Amino acid sequence: DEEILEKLRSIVSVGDPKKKYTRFEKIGQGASGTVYTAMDVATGQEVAIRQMNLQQQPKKELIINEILVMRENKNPNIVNYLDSYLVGDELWVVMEYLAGGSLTDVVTETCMDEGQIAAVCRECLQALEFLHSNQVIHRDIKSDNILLGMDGSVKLTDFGFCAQITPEQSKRSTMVGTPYWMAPEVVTRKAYGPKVDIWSLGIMAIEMIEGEPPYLNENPLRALYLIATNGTPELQNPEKLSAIFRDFLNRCLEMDVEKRGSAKELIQHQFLKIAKPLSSLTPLIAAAKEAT
Numbered sequence: 001d002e003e004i005l006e007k008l009r010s011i012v013s014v015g016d017p018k019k020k021y022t023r024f025e026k027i028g029q030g031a032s033g034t035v036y037t038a039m040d041v042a043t044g045q046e047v048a049i050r051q052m053n054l055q056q057q058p059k060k061e062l063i064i065n066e067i068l069v070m071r072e073n074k075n076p077n078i079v080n081y082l083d084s085y086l087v088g089d090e091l092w093v094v095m096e097y098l099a100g101g102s103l104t105d106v107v108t109e110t111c112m113d114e115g116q117i118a119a120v121c122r123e124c125l126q127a128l129e130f131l132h133s134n135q136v137i138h139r140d141i142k143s144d145n146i147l148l149g150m151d152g153s154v155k156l157t158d159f160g161f162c163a164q165i166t167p168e169q170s171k172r173s174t175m176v177g178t179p180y181w182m183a184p185e186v187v188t189r190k191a192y193g194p195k196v197d198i199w200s201l202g203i204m205a206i207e208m209i210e211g212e213p214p215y216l217n218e219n220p221l222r223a224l225y226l227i228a229t230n231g232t233p234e235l236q237n238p239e240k241l242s243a244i245f246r247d248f249l250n251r252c253l254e255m256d257v258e259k260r261g262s263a264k265e266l267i268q269h270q271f272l273k274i275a276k277p278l279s280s281l282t283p284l285i286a287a288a289k290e291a292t
């Protein structure tokens, strides 16, 4: 851990961020550290700062991996990592603040139309194609990790579970996902590849249609058995959906990994071309924020 802390020291900016940020507002406090909203004293930019007590953190190497991945994989559809600091045992990670809450807020509080869903799926797919082409699998894709700007900007967060693969080693085994969003091969096979993120996107699309992933009310172990054996989840009112959307869903939620679309393939899908401007999400985001 002397080694790990020293590695962290080389990554972070020097000194105390306490001078550099003002008006901290706690917006989270659980497990992964404390998250605050705050203002960059210099720029006026509003930021989100996660604070972690390192001696409490079980697996520090994952946090190191998270920061390195964020630093070197900047993208308009990924929440911007701005800076980090280490003050004794206290690690600070500073992110851009997304004032629009999360996709979960939206899908639980409002009712998205197909044009709005196509826009969100597109932005998510842009992040995934980029990540997968840089040999990064996110592994925990879910509506909670999709953060929104008031302008309808869609951005991926939470790189604590990501895998850095190779063209040589395309496959991973570690169990890191969230059960309801997990692709079947995660539990039915010894290993899995980047297309687990595509399946998770499929389940998010279902969240946007129906308000929840399949099996949400089941215990996660029961759910996992259902995912593993039932395969392609069933829809409540399939006939209410456009043919193009249904096709898109089917490509994401193929049981046969080889048959499931890759990010690069799905980017070309015609469902995405019905996308409304991202700005159309603003009213839902505003309503969700209020209700929330």
Ligand SMILES: Nc1ncnc2c1ncn2[C@@H]1O[C@H](COP(=O)(O)OP(=O)(O)OP(=O)(O)O)[C@@H](O)[C@H]1O
Binding pocket: 027, 028, 029, 030, 031, 032, 035, 048, 079, 095, 096, 097, 098, 099, 101, 102, 144, 147, 157
């Ligand atoms: N960059 C950010 N901008 C705006 N809000 C954020 C940002 N990062 C995190 N949050 C919000 O702060 C809260 C705490 O986030 P946290 O890191 O605990 O993730 P989480 O979604 O709570 O995951 P967990 O299941 O680990 O609690 C969440 O409501 C999250 O949406």
Ligand SMILES: [Mg+2]
Binding pocket: 144, 145, 158
């Ligand atoms: Mg999360």
Ligand SMILES: [Mg+2]
Binding pocket: 145, 157, 158
């Ligand atoms: Mg998170």
